[PDB]
Amino acid sequence: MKIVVMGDSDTVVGFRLAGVHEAYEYDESLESVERARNKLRELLERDDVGIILITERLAQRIGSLPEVKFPIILQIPDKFDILRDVVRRAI
Amino acid sequence: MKIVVMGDSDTVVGFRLAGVHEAYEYDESLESVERARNKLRELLERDDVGIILITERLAQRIGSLPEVKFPIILQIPDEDILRDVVRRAIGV
């Protein structure tokens, strides 16, 4: 099963570099939030998704998240072009 | 107008960091490939998507590729070496 992260662009960069299997980026515009809302409903229906990591802000923008025991849903606390030098030097 | 990339994690994180607007990861499992097929079909229907960059592997796994002129579909010539390197680089 897969580990998916949903959040803003910054948070997503880090988590992708850290090992998640799938990532979806969103900003706080109404349209983006609506898309994340539908995305979340979609991930809940996939039998190959076990863990969803979502930023506290996005979770609150979406609203009252579903009450399911599986997949596991974790909220990334609001604490977690500078990486431009790191990127170029790396690759 | 957006440029999208579809492929494995290493490729995806690299292209997103290189400027690509949207990126979607896929492995080679049947279910993941099937999700890629549907995603491709959806991207063709979006008005804000002009370019789709897809790894050579994934495109071949999908099989049939659209024959459209727009959006522009480009294959990327053919693992965690990239994510690992950027991670190690974070010795700040």
CA distance A79 to B17: 22
- What DSSP designation does A65 have? -
Backbone angles phi, psi at B63, to 5 degrees: 100, -100
Q: B23 is in which domain, residue-wise?
A: 2-92
* Angle A86-B1-B6 from CA coordinates, rounded to 5°: 55
Give the contacts of A74 (CB within 8 A, at least 6 positions apart). A51, A52, A53, A54
Q: Is B37 exposed, middle or buried (0-12, 13-18, 19+ CB in 10 A)?
A: middle
Q: Is residue B43 a contact partner of residue B49, using CB atoms and an 8 Å limit?
A: yes
What's the resolution in A?
2.4
* Angle A1-A21-A65 from CA coordinates, rounded to 5°: 75
Give the contacts of A18 (CB within 8 A, at least 6 positions apart). B83, B87
What CA–CA distances, in Å, run from A80 to A8, A13, A73, B69? 11, 11, 16, 42
CA-based R_g, chain A, Å:
14
CATH number at residue B72: 3.40.50.10580
Q: Do A91 and B83 touch (CB under 8 A)?
A: no
- What DSSP designation does A70 have? S
CA distance B30 to B32: 6
Nearest to B86 among A23, A25, A87 (CB): A87
- Tell me which method was used to determine the 3D structure: X-ray
Residue type, B21: H
What is the DSSP pairing of strand B22-25 with strand B49-55? unpaired
Q: Do A16 and B27 touch (CB under 8 A)?
A: no
Q: Is B17 exposed, middle or buried (0-12, 13-18, 19+ CB in 10 A)?
A: buried
Q: Which residues of A55-83 are buried (b: 16+ CB within 10 A; e: fewer)?
A: bebbbebbeebeeeeebebeebeeeeeeb
Backbone angles phi, psi at A26, to 5 degrees: -150, 155
Nearest to B89 among A18, A21, A86 (CB): A86
Q: How many domains does chain B have?
A: 1
